[PDB]
Amino acid sequence: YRLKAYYREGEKPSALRRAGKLPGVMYNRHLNRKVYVDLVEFDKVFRQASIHHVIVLELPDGQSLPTLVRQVNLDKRRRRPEHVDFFVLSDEPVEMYVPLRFVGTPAGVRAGGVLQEIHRDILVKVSPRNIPEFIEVDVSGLEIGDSLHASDLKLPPGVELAVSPEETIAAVVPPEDVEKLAEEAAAE
Amino acid sequence: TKNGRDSQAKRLGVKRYEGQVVRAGNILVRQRGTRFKPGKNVGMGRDFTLFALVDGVVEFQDRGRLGRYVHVRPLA
Amino acid sequence: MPRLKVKLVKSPIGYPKDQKAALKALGLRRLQQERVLEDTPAIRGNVEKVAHLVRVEVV
């Protein structure tokens, strides 16, 4: 994706938002530059892009930088993005959160279970060239009460699980209405 | 009820500060345990009271593991 | 340390004691009173902490 990023300097970060620009900074292992983008633009761009793909930032300098939001500071008091980071890549293997597509028909659904998920995006080390839109999650033969772990992952080549090879990925917990309530009020 | 109790203020802590003139025997700092260790021309007693053994200025010196020592630099 | 004209315009009555005292080190008796002290880092401080009571003038 793209985004017309501008250079900052002595602008009021607070009064800046009032205008309509989203404060933030782009930087890598050798970079550190005050910048800012447009609220409306970044809004619709980040909706799709999010923090899994790479968003090139077109500075007035004409520099097309392979950046991805390393971090977002969300304003409390009615959610809304305040600040944004933009970590630029190069040719060195970089870590990041990669999407996970839970595809299949869990045995829980059949027995009237609950679609549980934990890591909708795992942190993994990978080269800048590899941009796997997502990883096929074989969640299907998973019955109610069973769990798929990080050590049970199918990793696309050139990638490693930069986590703790035993980290929960998903589950299948039970429903809850009648039985629980009626029995809880009397057994609590 | 039964709670309204409390031993009056003992008023401890830092009595003298770095960059202060001191005679000989001035109670530098009265402390609980040993939050401040002695040092150059400074000794303590039973209640861990810190005082000057010479005449000069008070100085502090934080030394992580070792501790937060405090001394006095004699001059006249 | 060019001159510093200062005119008392906002009564200190009802304001913190320290501020009252500031108009003493600066020496401001009544209202609408002129006062052209020097521009020393010290004297500045006072004028500053009471700026909302006196309109400074760079002379």
């Binding site: 008091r77 970590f87 609950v114 679609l115 995006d121 809850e176 209405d177 | - | -």
Partner: protein, 136 residues
């Protein structure tokens, strides 16, 4: 719970840490005003929620009361209150995420969270999901 008897009042300053993000589930319920949420309130919204969509998925209740609600039994000033009458509450300031459902339909969610909102004293909002987490 388990710690010790009573606790202070303490004001409810800015809606700072009282406010998070949708960490689990799909939809979420956020507070707009600050106040103490009562145990009866949690359950009230709980039962209301789960009861709405019979055989519902998984209902996440992020908040959790632990503040001994103090109170006196219609008398005067002989020491500190017995409290415990209403039970306990939780420091709920604007932005917080009291509840959040999952594995269910959006319609089920929207209506439920709505009803459970009335079970709450604070005016509330319903946030989707987006992608606002913390990554790259």
């Amino acid at each position: 719970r388990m710690k010790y008897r009573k606790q202070q009042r303490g004001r409810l300053k800015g809606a700072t840490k009282g406010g998070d993000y949708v960490a689990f589930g799909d939809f979420g319920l956020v507070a707009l005003e600050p106040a103490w949420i009562t145990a009866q309130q949690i359950e009230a919204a709980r039962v209301a929620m789960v009861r709405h969509f019979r055989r519902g998925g998984k209902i996440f209740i992020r908040i959790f009361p632990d503040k001994p609600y103090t109170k006196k039994p219609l008398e005067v000033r002989m020491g500190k209150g017995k409290g415990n009458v209403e039970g306990y509450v939780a420091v709920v300031k604007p932005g917080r995420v009291m509840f959040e459902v999952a594995g269910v339909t959006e319609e089920q969610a929207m209506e439920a969270l709505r009803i459970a909102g009335h079970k709450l004293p604070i005016k509330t909002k319903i946030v989707r999901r987006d992608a606002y987490d913390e990554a790259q």
